[PDB]
C-alpha cells in the first residue's frame, strides 16, 4: 500500500480588503486533519479530525507559529510577484503551495513534493531528486537562481525524507481506526428510456471508503472502453464516497449488460444487472 | 507536522 502526508497552502491578495487571505490545510491521504485560517476569529491551527486532538498544547503552539511565519513569507512573495510580472497592485492574485511525502509499505519515500503555483499556474517545483528545481516561466527562473544560490532545497529535502515520513507514521497509528478503515460500496442499477428507443443503464456505487474503486459495465468478456460515461468519484459529508457509470443499450437487450464493482471493502466483486 | 518556508522567499 501507499500513504501520504501533504499540506495545501493558499495565499490570496485582496487590495483594499486588508492583508492577504492565508490558509493552510493538512491531509493524511485524502483526509483533512488540521487547518489554519487567517480570517478565523482566533488565527491558529485547529484540529479537523478526531485522532489529532490528543496532541499536546506545544504541538498546536508550534504549528501556529510555523503558519504565522509562513504567512509573512507569502505576504512578501505576493508583492515580489507583482514586481516580477510587472503587474498592478490593484488586483487579486493567488500563490499556492503543496508539500508532502508519498510513503510505501516499508517506510521508503516514493516521492517528495514541494511545489508552487501563481494565479493557478505552475510556478516552481522541486524535482523528484529533491535537489534541483523546475521553473515554469521567466519570473520563476529568478526564483530558481535565488534558491540555488541559497541552497534552499537541502532543508526541504530534510523535511520530506525525515519529519514528513516520521509524523505520517505517527498519524497513521493514532488515526488507524478511521484512516485505514474499509467501507463496502452499496450498489444499484437505474433504468431510463431516452426519447430515442434506446435505454440508459446507470450503475451506482454509494457509501464506500476509501475512494479507490473500479466501476465496469460488461458484455461477454472484458471490453466497453469508451461508450461508458463516468463521473469522477465525489465525496459525502461522512467521509464516504459515491460514483456511477452509465451505458446506452438497445431496448430489450438490457439483460445482457452487467455491472461490476471492485473495492477493498468487499470480500468479492459485486455483480449487478437490470 | 507541516513544512516551513523558513523565510526563503521567491
Amino acid at each position, epitope marked *: 500500500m501507499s500513504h501520504s502526508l501533504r499540506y495545501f497552502v493558499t495565499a490570496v491578495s485582496r487590495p483594499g480588503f486588508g492583508e492577504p487571505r492565508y490558509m493552510e490545510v493538512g491531509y493524511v491521504d485524502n483526509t483533512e486533519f488540521v487547518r489554519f485560517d487567517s480570517d478565523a476569529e482566533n488565527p491558529r491551527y485547529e484540529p479537523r479530525a478526531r485522532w489529532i486532538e490528543q496532541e499536546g498544547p506545544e504541538y498546536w503552539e508550534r504549528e501556529t507559529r510555523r503558519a504565522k511565519g509562513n504567512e*509573512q513569507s507569502f505576504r512578501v512573495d505576493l508583492r515580489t510577484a507583482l514586481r516580477y510580472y510587472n503587474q498592478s497592485a490593484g488586483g487579486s492574485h493567488t500563490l499556492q503551495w503543496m508539500a508532502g511525502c508519498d510513503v510505501e509499505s516499508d517506510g521508503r519515500l516514493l516521492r517528495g513534493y514541494w511545489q508552487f503555483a501563481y494565479d493557478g499556474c505552475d510556478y516552481i517545483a522541486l524535482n523528484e531528486d529533491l535537489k534541483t528545481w523546475t521553473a515554469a516561466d521567466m519570473a520563476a527562473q529568478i526564483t530558481r537562481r535565488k*534558491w540555488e*544560490q541559497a*541552497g534552499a532545497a537541502e532543508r526541504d529535502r*530534510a523535511y520530506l525524507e*525525515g519529519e514528513c515520513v516520521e509524523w505520517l507514521r505517527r498519524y497513521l497509528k493514532n488515526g488507524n481506526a478511521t484512516l485505514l478503515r474499509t467501507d463496502p460500496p452499496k450498489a444499484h442499477v437505474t433504468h431510463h428510456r431516452r426519447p430515442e428507443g434506446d435505454v440508459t443503464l446507470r450503475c451506482w456505487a454509494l457509501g464506500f471508503y476509501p475512494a479507490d474503486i473500479t466501476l465496469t459495465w460488461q458484455l461477454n468478456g472484458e471490453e466497453l472502453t469508451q461508450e461508458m460515461e463516468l463521473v469522477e468519484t465525489r465525496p459525502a459529508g461522512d467521509g464516504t464516497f459515491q460514483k456511477w457509470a452509465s451505458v446506452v443499450v438497445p431496448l430489450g437487450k438490457e439483460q445482457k449488460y452487467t455491472c461490476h464493482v471492485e473495492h477493498e471493502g468487499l470480500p468479492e466483486p459485486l455483480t449487478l444487472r437490470w | *507536522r507541516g513544512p516551513g518556508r523558513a*523565510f*526563503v*522567499t521567491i
Partner: antibody
Amino acid sequence: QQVRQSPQSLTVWEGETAILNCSYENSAFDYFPWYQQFPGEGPALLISILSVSNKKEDGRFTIFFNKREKKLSLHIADSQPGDSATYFCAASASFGDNSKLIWGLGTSLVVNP
Amino acid sequence: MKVTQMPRYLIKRMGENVLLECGQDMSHETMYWYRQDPGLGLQLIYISYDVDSNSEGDIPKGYRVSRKKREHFSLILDSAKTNQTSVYFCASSLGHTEVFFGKGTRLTVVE
C-alpha cells in the same frame, strides 16, 4: 545563553586538529551555520549543518552534531596559521515565526607555527 | 553577489546625526544591521523583511532604519552618543540561509 560557544579563546599548533565547541538550549533549533571572521573583515559563512545530520564535511572543516545532547563542534583538520580567526556558531528554528539568527559569542582561534 | 557598505570609516561629534548606507545585489528580501564591539559578539539592531517592514532587534535604542527600496538599507543615528562608537555591519540573506556581510563601518563618536 541560548547558543554557548567554548572556549572563548583556543590556541593550537599547526598540523593539529582544532576543535571548537558549542551547545544550545532550544531543542527547536535545526539549522547551525558557522561563520569565519578574519580581523578587519566581516563574517563569512564557512560551513553549516542541519539537525538531521550527525556530520558535515567540507575540505579540512567538519561539523559533528549530537541532537540528543544539544551539542555540536567544528573540527579543523591540519590547522594552519592562516586559519587564525574568530569563529561564530549560530542557530535558528527554521520553522519558527521570524528570520532572526541566534549567535554564539564566538571563539577566537590562534594557530601557532 | 555581495553586500556593499558606505562609508567604511566615519568620524562624528556627539549630538550630530549619522547615516550609514548599504546595498546588496542578490535580490534578498531580508536585510540586517549589526554592531560589533572590538573582540566581542554580533548585536542585532534592526531586521527588515521588506520595504517599510522593519522590526526591532536586540538593541534598537538610539538607532532607527529606513527601507524604501529592497536593494538598500539605511542605519540612522539621530543624536550620536560616544557609546555608539563601534563597527557596524550591514547584512542580507534569503531567510534562514547564508548571511552575507558588508566589510563594515568603523564609526567613532568623539567629544
